């Protein structure tokens, strides 16, 4: 009946989140029991591995020009405060592919290509690609793109996670609009602060990064929108967010 | 014929790079208009999302301590932690998943952080960590839209390391744990610590952290035994020394 | 020579050459790597390097000053020229550690990739604990190092550890082809691009972009950049000089 089951099988401990009536949603109780279980696992040298799972058929559903102008235009020195969705309808090369790295959500047409050919003409992709690309897709493919200058297909771009969708010819803007519609229904302060926390925390020392995250999370927790989210669910009615 | 068309449909702005005769190559004028669009999009509270696209064929050719520990927010486990994701993994479950090491997904599992849909954020580490662990664009998509990944997508983007048939995640996690259990305990512990603590820090500092944790492993009893057992064709008998 | 060093004009090919021991990293091979990297960085005529193994394996397993070891393994040293891995077969331990310092990576369909160190009471402490999670999805980097179990070529491709999987026996062929494309590119541009990519790392983006701008400037003002615009106006092959 305990909310976190703890089972020892020789050198392995199995932890089972156990609240079937809430499909194993975290509770203050379960979280206290987690803290205790981590201490046990850390202290007992005979425990060599731990497994985390959920009871039944759910794991945990969980809750409970001017250089200023140039830099800003290219999103090189500027980060957009709102979500930016790329509908990549075709060839995305050079400066286009440099700017793509400052888009958030990315839909590729079947026939789109992605490339930074700069080195082939004795230039470099110095509009952020050398800093950013390896942060966003696997290192070896970032390196390959920049040092060879050769383009990726849409399938490859999707394989290496440069984009998040590949869709039938001519439908990228349709799919982008559908994603946008989902975003505009979300809490606007929540969306803005989430993007800013994701971007500004970067890959910094985790402790500093978590401080950045907390600074942007606190205002969301205390917001009117956050309470509306709950009161809406449920005064049996959809949420009306205002961004405050 | 404006080089960057700006179109507003309610809370969405659509930006269209518009020099199709040049496959929408960036120009001075377009960059200037881009800057003005970003400013407009940032200032206007009624704009909640922007879409960027190209005209024609081309896109562009250029006790709080207890919660913190429990959620593994402020604590990192010293032993390997394997997630057997047997079903839906949403919100808090998906936040804590980022502090597991090795991850097995049931074919029917889904993975999501719906917080923004209720006016909240996944602030138990996800905004720090998710983009470090999977491709930036899918991390962004997950948090900003709040919509879940399927098991196949989670595996594609590397959120998980395995996808397995219905009801078999725990079986696979146990098999993985068995392999780890047979490995050198000091080596495993120090390896996890070195992986986590080196982080994405300046490589010089990161390697110093790695070297510190590696040195005691190299000179250990278990290293002599491990290499003897391998050579002698027998199970290593490790002690963590 | 446990490491063959051979030239094809601007391309240098390095072959780990102890096939009887599946090209295991020895003291002498690490020493010979260290000297090879020094030569490659110093020789302006070398525009790309390829690394591969003799026989069925690429590199499996493994008196010197620590600076020799550090340079040889590319632990404390970053090659100034592009390095292409032609992974012809098994790539385990030391070989998979060095792999993370190669830039472009071609895997034979039958190659495998792993760090079995913890299975023998060791850790992969030649950069893998630092680097692997930066280059592939965290959970798979964790699984590789903590379990010690290998990946197939198609799995390594899935997780972005390598950039290509090719038909059996053709990894060096594909590597030479990629090298030919690189050798035709601006050598100052390729050098400074690699330096900017590596040096910017995952640092605070303001600092990283300042690093990028400083390395970008001499490229933008170079003779090669001008020659590149002429050649991509006139519709001919560029003749670059690295200036």
Write up this protein.
The structure is a homotrimer. Chain A is α/β, with parallel strands linked by helices and 244 residues long. Chain A is 43% helix and 16% strand. Chain A folds into three domains: 1-64, GMP Synthetase, Chain A, domain 3, CATH 3.30.300.220; 65-185, 2-enoyl-CoA Hydratase, Chain A, domain 1, CATH 3.90.226; 186-244, Lyase 2-enoyl-coa Hydratase, Chain  A, domain 2 (Orthogonal Bundle). In chain A, helix 4 packs antiparallel against helix 5 and helix 8 (188-201) runs antiparallel to helix 9. The first copy, chain A, starts with a strand and ends in a 12-residue tail after the last helix. Chains in contact: A-B, A-C, B-C. At the A-B interface, strand 2, helix 1, strand 3, strand 4 and helix 2 of A face strand 2, helix 1, strand 3, helix 2 and strand 4 of B. Strand 5 (84-88) of chain A pairs parallel with strand 3 of chain B, so a sheet runs across the interface.
Show the largest interface.
Answer: A-B, 127 and 114 residues
Cα gyration radius of chain A (Å): 23 Å
List the secondary-structure elements of chain A in sequence, H or E.
EEHEEHEEHEEHHEHEHHHH
How helix-rich are the residues of chain A, as a percent range?
Answer: 40-55%
Overall SS class of chain A: alpha/beta
Oligomer: homotrimer
The percent range for strand residues of chain A is: 15-25%
Number of helices of chain A: 10
Query: Strands across the major sheet of chain A, in which order?
Result: 1-2-3
* Tally of structural domains of chain A: 3
The name of the CATH architecture of the largest domain in chain A is Alpha-Beta Complex
**CATH-defined fold name of the largest domain in chain A:** 2-enoyl-CoA Hydratase, Chain A, domain 1
- CATH class descriptor of the largest domain in chain A: Alpha Beta
**How far is the N terminus from the C terminus of chain A?**
41 Å
Main β-sheet description of chain A? 3 strands, mixed
- The count of β-strands of chain A is 10
GO biological process, one term (chain A): fatty acid beta-oxidation
Keywords (chain A): Lipid metabolism, Lyase
GO molecular function (chain A): hydro-lyase activity
Protein name (chain A): Enoyl-CoA hydratase/isomerase
